Amino acid sequence: ALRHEGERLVVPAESPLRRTLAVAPATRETVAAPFNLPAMIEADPAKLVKVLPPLAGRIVSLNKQLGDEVKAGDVLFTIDSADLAQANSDAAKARAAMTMARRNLDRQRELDKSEIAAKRDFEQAQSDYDQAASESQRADARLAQLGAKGGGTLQAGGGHILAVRSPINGRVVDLNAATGAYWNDTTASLMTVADLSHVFVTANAQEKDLGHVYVGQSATVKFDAYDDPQPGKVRYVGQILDADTRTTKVRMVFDNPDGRLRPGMFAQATFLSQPHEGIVVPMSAIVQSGFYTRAFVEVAPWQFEPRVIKLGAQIGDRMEVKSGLSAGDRVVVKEGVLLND
């Protein structure tokens, strides 16, 4: 009665599970798991651009339209920033005032001096100037900031109207802007240009099936709502998990000549791992407590040690233990030498 503890678990020599416990060495065998991954269609990250405006302002026009063809670099929309209007003139004011305010000062130094001095008014002269200068210096920077943002899309004259161009060839794939509407946000994004002649079919894999993927495979992709499955080859790859989901991206590029392949659609895939010599236990041997997962190994007769393992592929009741658990260990089957009940 019935499990004593060191950390490692000793069974008397007395106890009932002395009948019901069972063990076998851990056998290395060949594995060639077929495995299956959820996937989604994805535009080629660019290849696709959500075009944003460089500055806010009234939309003057929408050349190009949902479905319309585009070439790099057509004009897609035009913005009347104002905004940039103000700031251009304000800084015209700002400077005028200064320059004038200045030479009003300069003509008050020369009459203190030369001949005979007049009145304190020099005092206003200076305060007035110092101020107009600071304010101009202010306007100067507002223009500076703004023009740096919308300088590359300006035309000569106009109203200070920006013309945003498309940087790549494709079709207008999303719209969501109105002529006359003011656009305040950014990104925001007035439209979306894209060339989906080819798409990514991006499947996502788990640590379970991560040693089982390789650039080079060898995939069968079955969408919905398309009955007829379709072949692919993975181009990428791995190689870091996603923290939230703990999956990694495994993507294959598809031709989309029709293109019944639409970014967003769902699919599955459908792979075969290279044969490799792997170690495998029955389900009866694995136990989970949290985010783990471990088997029990006999030491020492009737003395067991926990062992943190991971894990998969499985199917059916056989389970690939990818570490470990190494060849020969007397693993239990099993079972609840982890509760005392």
Task: Identify which of residues 151 and 238 has a Cβ nearer to Zn ion in the complex.
Answer: 238
Phi, psi of 17 (to 5 degrees): -65, 0
As a whole number of Å, the CA-based R_g of the chain is: 37
The distance of closest approach from Cβ of residue 320 to Zn ion in the complex, given in angstroms and rounded to an integer, is 5
Site for Zn ion in 93-132 (CB under 5 A): none
The DSSP output letter for 313 is: -
Burial 142-154 (b: 16+ CB within 10 A, else e): bbeebbeebeebb
Residue 284 · residue 291 · CB < 8 Å: no
Q: Which lies closer to Zn ion via its Cβ, residue 66 or residue 215?
A: 215
In order, the DSSP letters of 134-200 are: HHHHHHHHHHHHHHHHHGGGB-SSTTSEEEEE-SS-EEEEE----TT-EE--SS--SEEEE--SEEE
Q: How far is the CB of 312 from Zn ion (least distance, A)?
A: 8
Q: Which residue, 8 or 310, has its beta carbon nearer to Zn ion? A: 310
Buried/exposed code over 315-332 (b: 16+ C-beta within 10 A; e: otherwise): eeeebbbbeebeeebebb
CB of 294 vs Zn ion, minimal distance in Å: 19
* Closest separation in Å from C-beta 29 to Zn ion: 11
Residue number with CB closer to Zn ion (96 or 283): 283
Helix, strand or coil, per DSSP, at residue 22 = coil
Sheet holding 27-31, edge to edge: 27-31, 276-282, 318-320
18 contacts 1 by C-beta, under 8 angstroms: no
Longest dimension (CA), the chain: 124
Cβ 293 to Zn ion, closest distance in Å?
16
State in angstroms the smallest separation of the CB of 33 from Zn ion.
7
- Say if residue 298 carries a ligand binding annotation: no
Q: How far is the CB of 208 from Zn ion (least distance, A)?
A: 9
Binding track, positions 275-304, relative to Zn ion; x by CB under 5 A: ---x--------------------------
End-to-end CA distance of the chain: 11
Binding site annotation covers 276? Answer: yes
Question: Residues touching Zn ion: how many (CB under 5 A)?
Answer: 1
Name which of 278 and 306 has its Cβ closer to Zn ion: 278
Query: What's the closest the beta carbon of residue 212 comes to Zn ion, in angstroms?
Result: 6
15 within 8 A of 304, measured Cβ to Cβ: no
Which parts of 36-121 fold into alpha helices (H)?
84-109
Helix (H, G, I), strand (E, B) or coil at 243: coil
212 labelled ligand-binding: yes
CB-nearer residue toward Zn ion: 214 or 302: 214
Contact map string, positions 239 to 278, toward Zn ion, x by CB under 5 A = ---------------------------------------x
The smaller minimum CB distance to Zn ion, of residues 193 and 269, is found at 269
84/313 with CB nearer Zn ion: 313
Question: What does the binding site for Zn ion look like in residue numbers (CB under 5 A)?
Answer: 278
> Which residue ranges are tagged as binding site?
212, 276, 320
> Which residue ranges are tagged as binding site for Zn(2+)?
212, 276, 320
